[PDB]
Every structure is written in C-alpha cells, then in structure tokens.
Swiss-Prot record, chain A:
InterPro entries: Rbsml_eL15_core_dom_sf, Ribosomal_eL15, Ribosomal_eL15_CS, Ribosomal_uL23/eL15/eS24_sf. A lipid is attached at G1 (N-myristoyl glycine). The keyword Phosphoprotein applies. It is found in: Cytoplasm. Keywords: Cytoplasm, Isopeptide bond, Lipoprotein, Myristate, Phosphoprotein, Ribonucleoprotein, Ribosomal protein, Ubl conjugation. This is Large ribosomal subunit protein eL15. Residues 168-181 have a biased composition (Basic residues). Component of the large ribosomal subunit. The ribosome is a large ribonucleoprotein complex responsible for the synthesis of proteins in the cell.
From Swiss-Prot, chain B:
Hydroxylated on His-38 by MINA. InterPro entries: Rbsml_uL15_N, Ribosomal_uL15, Ribosomal_uL15/eL18, Ribosomal_uL15/eL18_sf, Ribosomal_uL15_CS. Pfam families: Ribosomal_L27A. The gene is RPL27A. Belongs to the universal ribosomal protein uL15 family. The modification N6-acetyllysine is found at K46, K54, K109. GO terms for molecular function: structural constituent of ribosome. It comes from Oryctolagus cuniculus (Rabbit). This is Large ribosomal subunit protein uL15.
Swiss-Prot record, chain D:
It holds the Pfam family Ribosomal_L36e. Its main location: cytoplasm. This is Large ribosomal subunit protein eL36. One of its GO terms (biological process) is translation. PANTHER family: 60S RIBOSOMAL PROTEIN L36. Component of the large ribosomal subunit. InterPro entries: Ribosomal_eL36, Ribosomal_eL36_sf. Signal peptide: none annotated. Residues 12-30 have a biased composition (Basic residues). The modification N6-acetyllysine is found at K61. Component of the large ribosomal subunit. The ribosome is a large ribonucleoprotein complex responsible for the synthesis of proteins in the cell. The lineage of its organism: Eukaryota, Metazoa, Chordata, Craniata, Vertebrata. GO terms for cellular component: cytosol; ribonucleoprotein complex; ribosome. It comes from Oryctolagus cuniculus (Rabbit).
Length: 203, 147, 210, 102
RNA sequence: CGCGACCUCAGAUCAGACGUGGCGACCCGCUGAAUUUAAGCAUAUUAGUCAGCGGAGGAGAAGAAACUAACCAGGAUUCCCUCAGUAACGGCGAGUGAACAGGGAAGAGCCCAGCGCCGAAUCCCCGCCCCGCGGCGGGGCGCGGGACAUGUGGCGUACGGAA
RNA sequence: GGCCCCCGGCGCGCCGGGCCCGGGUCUUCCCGGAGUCGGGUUGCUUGGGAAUGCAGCCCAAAGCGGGUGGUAAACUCCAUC
C-alpha cells in the first residue's frame, strides 16, 4: 500500500527528492503567519499513525516555533545570587519545541482538543509543526465510540498538563532502572512520597 | 510524664541548670558534625577512629539478595529437627542416620562451631566449611551438596 | 558539638519536614472502610469466591527466595493451552491469565496445568438462563451450594518432602564436599583462560607444520 | 563418583528439565519481509543516496576502507552501526561493478 | 474571453455548536530563589523547596514492559510495610540517598496506523411521518445536500493475525 | 417500631429494532510507528558514579534490526523486552 512507500521515502530525508521538497515547503511556510490552519495534513501517513482520521471534526494547525535554547529573562545579567545560578546564556528549556508548538495550538483553539503533533521541516531560525486537533462536540466525534474518550472533560488541555506524546517525554517516565524519579505518578509525586514523614500511630 | 522530669525541679532557679558564667546559647560548637577536622577533631579521632577517608572498592548496583547466605553452626544442628529423630537414632540398630535438610530450615551455609554428638547424620546444604565437613565425618556421617 | 562517645549520626530533618508530616489517625477509619467495601464486593459477586480469580503457583526469583513459592499474577497461555481452556473464556470462569509469562521448566508447567484441572473439577458453573443447557452443572450442585468460598481460592501451601533415614553408603562418606566446592569455584574462575592457552597451544602445533 | 548438584561452579544450579516452547511472536520484529524489502529498495532507486553515504562510497572505491569506517563512525555514531553501513555500501558498490561488467 | 472543474485563500449580525472567568485543600506541566547549614565561603546544602505562570478532576497523574532479573526465575499502574539511612553521591566535609527482590491493600485489561481483504460496505447535516421527548434518541421514508479514495467503516494488532 | 410522600437500585411480562455472531487440527500467506533511535554536545537534573533523566545545537540510522543487561572501549556468546 502507498502509505508504506510514503513512509520509507520520508525516512530518506537526506535524499535528493525529500531535501528539495523540504527546502521548498520550509520556504513557503516561512512566508506565512506563525499559526495557520492547514486545509489537509502535509504528512497524511504520519497523521494516521498518530491518530488523525480523514473525517469531519479533525483539524490541523501548522504552527511555527522559534528555534534554539532559552536565555534567562533577567535584566542585563544580574541573576543576583550564588554563582551557581549566574548562568543566562547556555541553558535549556525542559519541554521540547514540538510541545511548545502543541501548547500554542492548544492555547489558540480553546474548544479544540489537542491530540498529537508531527514535524514538517526546520530552518535555522524556526521549526515547523502540525498539530492534529479535534472538536469534542461535533457529533461525528461524539457518536463514534472509539474517539469519544476525548470528549470527556479530563482530557481538556492535554498539551497544557504534559499529556500529548511530545510533552510526555519531558516528564521523564518509562518503566525500568533508567527512571525511578517518576516511580509514583510523576517526578513531583515521588519526591512527595520520599519526603513524607510517615508518622504512625504506635511507632 | 512532665511531672517526673527535671524542669519542674528547676523552677525558681535562675539559670535553669545551664549556669550563669556561660549560658545556654544557641549553637556554640557549630551545628551537628561540624568541625570533624577542626575544633572537634579530638572527639572524632578518639571515639571514631577512621571516620575520615575513602577505602576499598565501589560497587554500583548492589543487590543484597545475591549475597544471601545465612549460616548455622554444628553447635545446634540437631535443633533443626524434632527431638524424636535424634532419639529414633541412638536406637533403631540399623545404623540409619536421619537426614537434616538445612536449606529447608533457612540456612544455606553450614559452618563448624561446636561439638557434634556421636550420632550419624546426613546434612544436606548449599555450602559447608572445611571444619564442619570434618566434624560431620568424624561423627560417622555424610555431607551432601544441594543446588 | 559532640561530647564523649556516641554515634556520629545524621538525621534528615533539614528540609521543611513538618510541612509534609503524614499522620495515621485515619487508619482505623480506613481499615473499616476497606472492610465494608470488601463485604459489599462479596455480596455483589454472589456465589463467586470473594478472593478473586484463581491464580497460578509460582517460584520467587533470586537465590534468597528461590525455595519459597507464592501465588503468581496469572496462568500462562501454554498452561491454558495444555489444560484446554480457551484463553478468552478463562477470564469468564475466574481464572487469572497473564500472557507475559514465559515458561522455562516443565516442572512448573505441569503443576500449573494440574491446578487448572483441579479447579475445573471443583467449579460450579451456573447456566445462563434458569433453563439449563450444556456445560452448566446440575441443580443438585447448585442448591447444595450457591456458596461463596472464604479466603484465597485453593491456597498455595509451600510444602516439604520428608526424607527417610538412609544408611550412608561408602561413597557419600567418601565425598569431600568442601574440597569439591573449592575445585568447582576455581574451574569457573579458570575455565576461560585455560581455553585461551589451549587455543594458543593448538595454534603453536599448527604453526609447527607450516 | 558422586555428582551432587552444586550452587556454585560452571554447571551449577538446580537441575530441572527444560521445555522447548514456541518462541513468542514479539521476538521476530525487524525480520526483513519479502514485500518490505521490495518497498525498501524500490525507494533507494527513487530517492537515492545521502551525501555522507556517497562520500564513503568514494573512499571505499579507493580501497581506503579504514578511513571509510572512521568517517562513518563519526557520522552515524556507533562502531556497530558504522560497520553494518560500510558492508551495505561495499555490497552496493559491488553490484554496480557487476552491473557495469556486461 | 467567456463558461466549467479543482487548489489555496478571504468575507458574512450566514445555520448550529463550543472556548473565555472563577475556586484552588488535594493533582498535572513549567519556572525557580535567598535567608539557612558548613561554626568563614565560592562547589555543596537550604531545594526542584517559597514566591511566579499555566491546566484539571472528584480525584488527578500513572498504567498494560523497548520491565525486572541472572533465579529451579518473576510479570501493567498506584498505595502501605520492608528493603534502608542501605548501594551510591559529596570541598568523600557538612550533609544527601534510591531501586529489585519479600509481604500485603487492589486487581482489569484494551484499541489503532500499518500489512490485507471486502462495489465506501462509513459519517455528518437537511426535509416528511410514527413513537419518545427536563441527560435530542429510535424506526421508517426522500434522486434532498455534503464529507470521504490525499482513505471512512467491518474483520485484525504481536498474548500472534488472516485466508 | 408505625404511617405517609418521593426517588433510587435491582426482578418478571410485552412490544420495537438490531444479531446467523464458535472452537480446536493441517496447509498457504501477513506482519509494525524517523528528523525518531543512536552518537557528539553544551546546560540543568539525578544516589546513578568515563553522562539517571530532560534539553538546545550538530550529526543522523537499521531490519535475524533495535533497546536494555548500573565502569569507558573491541571481539564474542547468552538473557530480556
Ligand atoms: Mg551554592
Ligand atoms: Mg527521546
Ligand atoms: Mg545541665
Ligand atoms: Mg543567665
Ligand atoms: Mg558551655
Ligand atoms: Mg487480595
Ligand atoms: Mg479556568
Ligand atoms: Mg555559614
Ligand atoms: Mg555561625
Ligand atoms: Mg558570612
Ligand atoms: Mg538538590
Ligand atoms: Mg507554589
Ligand atoms: Mg486519569
Ligand atoms: Mg507502552
Ligand atoms: Mg515492580
Ligand atoms: Mg537496619
Ligand atoms: Mg537532594
Ligand atoms: Mg484500514
Ligand atoms: Mg543538584
Ligand atoms: Mg560492564
């Protein structure tokens, strides 16, 4: 089936074909606003593996994000404090750019419920992304049982809480020895557990 | 029981048992184990010889259960079994010798402290001492390795 | 400041711990709540064991625990396959099934098949309607018990096989255990180099020809 | 002469009979399928090769094959990936050489 | 020099929907000190703690192994007891500091993309009738619109699956 | 203990629809998520120590592959996802 071809082609990103296209796409995207609703998914394939479905009430915003790290917002330098914390230039945000991308798509379209995102290119200055969104109150989603989990109000603002695939990754949770921080729910919760004087009745 | 404590008997007296030349100030030494090298050194190196310094090899992902090997002495090996195995034996007249599975009772190694009574055995165990073996043989028994 | 002899001891009360003290005044109230909730769940699953489903027998890991045996999480697929219970159905008759369990040795497998067989013997499957089709048991074994089973269903008891008094053949007596262990240690230690020197010597014998 | 099972040394541990079950289906992942192979190489004649790959082919042609690997390791990352790539490149280069000779 | 497809884009007080603020004990994501300790202090510590911003729910988060182990092996997540003030970190000073096993509380497991087969077999909105209507649903009937082949629905997902 | 309201929850009947929904045995086919993994790096973070986890930047994959197997690397068997 064509999707497997498309998939394998897109892995040849250093190839002559895909490099040509990526350059032309990235030029084109750069010549638009920072947030615009793509009429259809640039990457159909990827979108399907991430859970897009080509029916009504699935949406896709292409969102630009400025690239590079995070300089410490303090006037001049003047991070007054112990010279551990004197750093301002070479320091780096916890979440990814892709998460930031989703978060912004989420912010803008409050009714819409961020499902998942994928990449469409990168300049020196910008990255580009494509956030799949969903109306939780369009009948075609509501009545389809397999999606109607997103219409539940626990799934409000997934991206804001660190719950999309992208913003999950910063949280630092997976099974096995390479984690332990996040061995309750999350990073914060384990610390909480580990720094509770459990003070029993009888002692 | 505050009733019994010392502050009840100190009521009335000025200094509260802390003296009046020197007082009860907050932290005159430094907090805690401060000064281990300087200014508390003598206490450290006459009641904790060897506090300071590294020694030996690091071992990163220590898991204690690998090195699990609870020992038992010949001293009290017969304790593992009901008296009537040690009694139906020194009797019987077959020269039978009853088995003692030490690993069942929760000891892996059998070390050799103590006098073993002149009364044959078959000791099943994961590990043995040299002496524990020897004593067992001298009783007229047989050590038996188990996985 | 330390004064004459004592453990040079490190307490961990430097963070704001009184902000995170966790009292246990619940616990009685808790213990009850669980207990009510427990009795409710029994009553809901009416003649079904209060326990839960049946669970496999399983040995612990590590040299330490090794000798003991617990209840496992669920019966493997091979064990269901050999017993002849369709895995999707086994859930519906109160048989725990995990499918992530390997099955290394055949001693642990046949035991766990035996478990399921025994379960299926002493199980009282009620028919779907009061009108009785196949599988569903007789109204005798139904009226005589729509009874719950208190406690864990067919409990595992870690058990020992009594060894009778032998005679000690002149061979057991001959054995030198401690030595044997020392030897067995050194051969694991030295296996690998010995093989490298032999590989060296073999190369020297072949090199002599050419 | 009496071979008690031991808890320590080479053929150690509790002696138990082994069943030889069907290996889990999870274990066969990454096995190259006839149809996937066809797709993979169907695309290597559309898309062609990357720049670093091409540069390595040119090294391999010259028979300077250590420098080829030194390059691929710095480029790809590991040794084992670099070595596996160098074999593919040498295979490609050979099938060109066979194709030319006709 | 028109008319017609589509593509990409606009504008509507267009028809019908949703989002905005609050609360914040508990919860998720960021951000993030300095008093303080070290008898001084800069790494360390205080602390991923206070303050700061964001977003929730009746709980949240987590969760059905790219896991543990190295055993005769265990088998999602969470919680307690233990592991253990231990392995480890550390001007190896002050200080800091987990995990597996073991025993419990509870216990529940599943679905896509893909790969394939099936006349798109699917969905939304209109309009007419019968029931039902204070959580807008059922059934029928319309050459009544649209979405959709740049892929909807049934079967199926590694515990194998299809024919 | 009683009576009266209301509401819930479960039991039986009727109708309206939907719904022709198994298992084993042998054969022939089918099979996996990329700017991701991985590497280098710098900064934070961790008990995690020749890098526990998260980041930016650069490189940038494979398919008997990939990941893990708590000391860097090469060769090699195993185990485990
Ligand atoms: Mg500091
Ligand atoms: Mg990652
Ligand atoms: Mg005094
Ligand atoms: Mg005074
Ligand atoms: Mg004084
Ligand atoms: Mg229970
Ligand atoms: Mg709000
Ligand atoms: Mg100070
Ligand atoms: Mg001071
Ligand atoms: Mg000062
Ligand atoms: Mg800290
Ligand atoms: Mg706060
Ligand atoms: Mg939840
Ligand atoms: Mg997973
Ligand atoms: Mg666990
Ligand atoms: Mg202790
Ligand atoms: Mg700390
Ligand atoms: Mg499909
Ligand atoms: Mg730190
Ligand atoms: Mg090693």
């Amino acid at each position: 089936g064509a999707y497997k071809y498309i998939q394998e082609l897109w892995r040849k990103k250093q190839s002559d074909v895909m490099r040509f296209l990526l350059r032309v796409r990235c030029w084109q995207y750069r010549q638009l606003s920072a947030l615009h609703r793509a009429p259809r998914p640039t990457r159909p394939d990827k979108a399907r593996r991430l859970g897009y479905k080509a029916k009504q009430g699935y949406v896709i915003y292409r969102i630009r994000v400025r690239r590079g790290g995070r300089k410490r917002p303090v006037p001049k330098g003047a991070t007054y404090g112990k010279p551990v914390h004197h750093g301002v230039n070479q320091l780096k945000f916890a979440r990814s750019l892709q998460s930031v991308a989703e978060e912004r798509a989420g912010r803008h379209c409050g009714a819409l419920r961020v499902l998942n995102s994928y990449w469409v290119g990168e300049d020196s200055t910008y990255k580009f992304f494509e956030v799949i969104l969903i109306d939780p109150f369009h009948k075609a989603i509501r009545r389809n049982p397999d999606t109607q989990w997103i219409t539940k109000p626990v799934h409000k603002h997934r991206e804001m809480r660190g719950l999309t695939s992208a913003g999950r990754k910063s949280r630092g949770l997976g099974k096995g020895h390479k984690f332990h921080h996040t061995i309750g729910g999350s990073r914060r919760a384990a610390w909480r557990r580990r720094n509770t004087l459990q003070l029993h009745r009888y002692r | 029981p505050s009733r019994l404590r010392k502050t009840r008997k100190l009521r009335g007296h000025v200094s509260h048992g802390h003296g009046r030349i020197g007082k009860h100030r907050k932290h005159p030494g430094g907090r805690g184990n401060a000064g281990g090298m300087h200014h508390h050194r003598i206490n450290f190196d006459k009641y904790h010889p060897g506090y300071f310094g590294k020694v030996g090899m690091r071992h990163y992902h220590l898991k204690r259960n690998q090195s699990f090997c609870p020992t038992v002495n010949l001293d009290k090996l017969w304790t593992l079994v009901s008296e009537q195995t040690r009694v139906n034996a020194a009797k019987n007249k077959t020269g039978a010798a009853p088995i003692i599975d030490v690993v069942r009772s929760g000891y892996y190694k059998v070390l050799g402290k103590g006098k073993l009574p002149k009364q044959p055995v078959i000791v099943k165990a994961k590990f043995f001492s040299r002496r524990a073996e020897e004593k067992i043989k001298g009783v007229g028994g047989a050590c038996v390795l188990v996985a | 400041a330390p004064s004459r002899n004592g453990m040079i001891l490190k307490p961990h009360f430097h963070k704001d711990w009184q902000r995170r003290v966790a009292t246990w005044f619940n616990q009685p109230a808790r213990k009850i709540r669980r207990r009510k909730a427990r009795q409710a769940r029994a009553r809901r699953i009416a003649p079904r064991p209060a326990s839960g489903p049946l669970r496999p027998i399983v040995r612990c890991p590590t040299v330490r625990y090794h000798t003991k045996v617990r209840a496992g999480r669920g019966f493997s697929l091979e064990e269901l396959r050999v017993a002849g219970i369709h895995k999707k159905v086994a859930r519906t008759i109160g048989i725990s099934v995990d499918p992530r369990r390997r099955n290394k040795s055949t001693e642990s497998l046949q035991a766990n098949v035996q478990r399921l067989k025994e379960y299926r013997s002493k199980l009282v499957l009620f028919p779907r309607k009061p009108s009785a089709p196949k599988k569903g048991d007789s109204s005798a074994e139904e009226l005589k018990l729509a009874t719950q089973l208190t406690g864990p269903v067919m409990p595992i008891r870690n058990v020992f096989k009594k060894e009778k008094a032998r005679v000690i053949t002149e061979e057991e007596k001959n054995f030198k255990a401690f030595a044997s262990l020392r030897m067995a240690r050194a051969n694991a230690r030295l296996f690998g180099i010995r093989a490298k020197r032999a590989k060296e010597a073999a190369e020297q014998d072949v090199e002599k020809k050419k | 002469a009496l071979r008690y099972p031991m808890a320590v040394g080479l053929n150690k541990g509790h002696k138990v009979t082994k069943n030889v079950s069907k290996p889990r289906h999870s274990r066969r992942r990454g096995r190259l399928t006839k149809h996937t192979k066809f797709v993979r190489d169907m695309i290597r004649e559309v898309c062609g090769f990357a720049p670093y790959e091409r540069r390595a082919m040119e090294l391999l042609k010259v028979s300077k094959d250590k420098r080829a690997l030194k390059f691929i390791k710095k480029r790809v990352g590991t040794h084992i990936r670099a070595k596996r790539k160098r074999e593919e490149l040498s295979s490609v280069l050979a099938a060109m050489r066979k194709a030319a000779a006709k």
